[PDB]
Amino acid sequence: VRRACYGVLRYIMESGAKGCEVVVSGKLRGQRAKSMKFVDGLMIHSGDPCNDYVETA
Amino acid sequence: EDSKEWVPVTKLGRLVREGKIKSLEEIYLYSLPIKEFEIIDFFLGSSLKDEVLKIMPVQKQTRAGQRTRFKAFVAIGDNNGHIGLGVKCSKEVATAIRGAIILAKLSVVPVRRGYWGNKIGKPHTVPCKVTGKCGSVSVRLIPAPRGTGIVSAPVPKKLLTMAGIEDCYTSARGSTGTLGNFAKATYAAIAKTYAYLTPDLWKEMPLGSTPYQAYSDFLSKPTPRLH
Amino acid sequence: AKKRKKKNYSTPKKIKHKRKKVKLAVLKYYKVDENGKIHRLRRECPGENCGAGVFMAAHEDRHYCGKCNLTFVFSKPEEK
RNA sequence: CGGGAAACCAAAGCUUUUUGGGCUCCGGGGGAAGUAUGGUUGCAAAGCUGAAACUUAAAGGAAUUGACGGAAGGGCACCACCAGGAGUGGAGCCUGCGGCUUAAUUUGACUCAACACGGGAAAACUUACCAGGUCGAACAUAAGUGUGUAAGACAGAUUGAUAGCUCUUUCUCGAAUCUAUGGGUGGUGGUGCAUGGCCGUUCUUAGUUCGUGGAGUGAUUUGUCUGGUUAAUUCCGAUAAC
RNA sequence: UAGCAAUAAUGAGAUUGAGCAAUAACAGGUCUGUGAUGCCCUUAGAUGUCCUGGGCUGCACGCGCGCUACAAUGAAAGUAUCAACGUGUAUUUCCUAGACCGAGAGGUCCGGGUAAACCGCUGAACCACUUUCAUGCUUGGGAUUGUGAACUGAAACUGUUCACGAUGAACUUGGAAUUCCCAGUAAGUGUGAGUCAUUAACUCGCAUUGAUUACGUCCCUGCCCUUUGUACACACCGCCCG
Fold it and tell me: Where are the zinc fingers (C4-type) (chain C)?
């Protein structure tokens, strides 16, 4: 989760994206759940570009 | 193993890339800083092994409430007498390791090894008795005679095989249970090996060649020209 | 037994038998007269548009067919 | 060119690379305890001497980040006041919640951030509840003469109702599933302290992460600023990068 | 380098209200939003699925948001007359026209609108005028309550709602305390929509009437910024002493 999900981070940066973040949350069987954000780039989160530029699933 | 060759952003990194000098000790002779890490893995790096020491967490109290920077200690070394420590804290443990290797490849300092009472056969351990402090931990180094395998704790055991020294006796004053400040206290000693004025070095010398002024108007060009 | 969340064992204590059916020796001794006269045992529906060869036993005289499972109840004095 | 863990200090430095001018006093984890006891001094109060039993995995020093409170400073807001106005708290009823009650008052939520919520204005349904009361669901996937493995539906009975729910009387089911289940598919059953997603406040705000850097032994640290500037990390700036 | 006294100028100092909303997390809420879900649990003796009814509406009491009023600026019967947001039937069960039959609730028979077309100039409600009540706990107020007339739901009871006569409770403005707000805002008054077979005092909207009083400070209670103390760091709901 810290490497194979880290490999697909700039597997998509080859197209020329402005930035990508990947939030993977849950338990690592330390049953208290954790979450680390894989930030890389210049990402908006707000305003009209939030409806426009960013895309999430 | 470049695999993409990088531009020299500094001055003497271009001279390294120009082939103006093939002597790493020429940098050490005038004590000008190796500023970019791409310098020495051109001069060195042929399976020059490093190993991490110490990656224990370091926290900071915030409002909600405690976030961790993982600080790494990496130790790189030439077995013919060069050494380095890496000291870098990061967010997570991957870039803690890789970020300090650049710092490990920039703190690379030559090691003076020598003889004690018998000028026979590949200078072995240390020319004299040296020590160095950082934060209460002192480590004297004793020139042990031939075939007297390393007498130290495991933190400078793995560090002094990377230094080109045959064997050592050592006597470490201080709180050496802090496994990172132990490592940095050894280096102030080994950096003093080329700072002790032995009577081997009482002649005057050929004074140097001034690598700025000797290679001056071959840098009056404005181009970053390699070979 | 069984376990609910909050209230257990309201106690009719729940022995469930829909039909018993360790009983009911089937009426296969079918009266056939001497060949080729025949007899209808334990009278089924007189109009045989349904199959209804089910042979209900001698009850108190209210005899119900079984292919039509309780409809067409017939011996009988029925209605006008 | 010092030194130290630092705070810091022309000494607290010259305690090199276990160092060395000379002399004297004192300490050896924390307590029990400057107690007990003996001796000595004293008019007394008390002073100078001074243990152990037992107990203990830490006590402590200098610094760092948060905590941001009879800590001063500089600022902000009608979920804060001043100045106003309107309502609640009075009564009536509606509804929520607590309690009691009963078989159930299903139940989930309890300062803001639970409480006319769950978009829950519930006649059944919803509903998970209660009381009777049917009906078959998937890894023991079945050993067993289908005379039954699981229901549709007569009168007496029964039930909420001939409901064959069940039974007297007794036919009828279609192994195209009772497996006599591994403590299970399902389940509005358990745990949101296992969790995902969702949102909620946190948080009326202005805050936050960097890559390299002149800055620490180090946690960390002008970078993200004393402006005498703005809803605002907002700025002609001091500038100590962009 | 900010003479922000240029109110001017101007439909406009923004129409100015809103949607999105970083870093960091909470043991916030939901397993009873789901075929998101771990494991647990029980299913031939079902928690499921429901077969019927009851309950969630049980009431000596506490508490919460509300509705209606405590009237003569009003109340009462008439008489004048203006909305806006929108919703509107297709195994149809909706918006509704125009006749008929009804004290009314509601009944018969036909018509329009799948919608800027028809309701619909959506010609709504206080406010406007005239009379009746004289400020009597009175026709203020409509709690309570008997009987009839009805409606939808097969089926209507500590109730499913709706009118007609009758009853006319408390309340004469609400203690301590405590809310919401600076302009088309508060507050008054309606209407649409939500769930809806039937039932809105609820919330999501919308129009209409349209003030007072600031035009600001840090007292109150919070939130930021640093400087500063700390023996706190499950963080002052701390730690902690006899």
Answer: 45-68
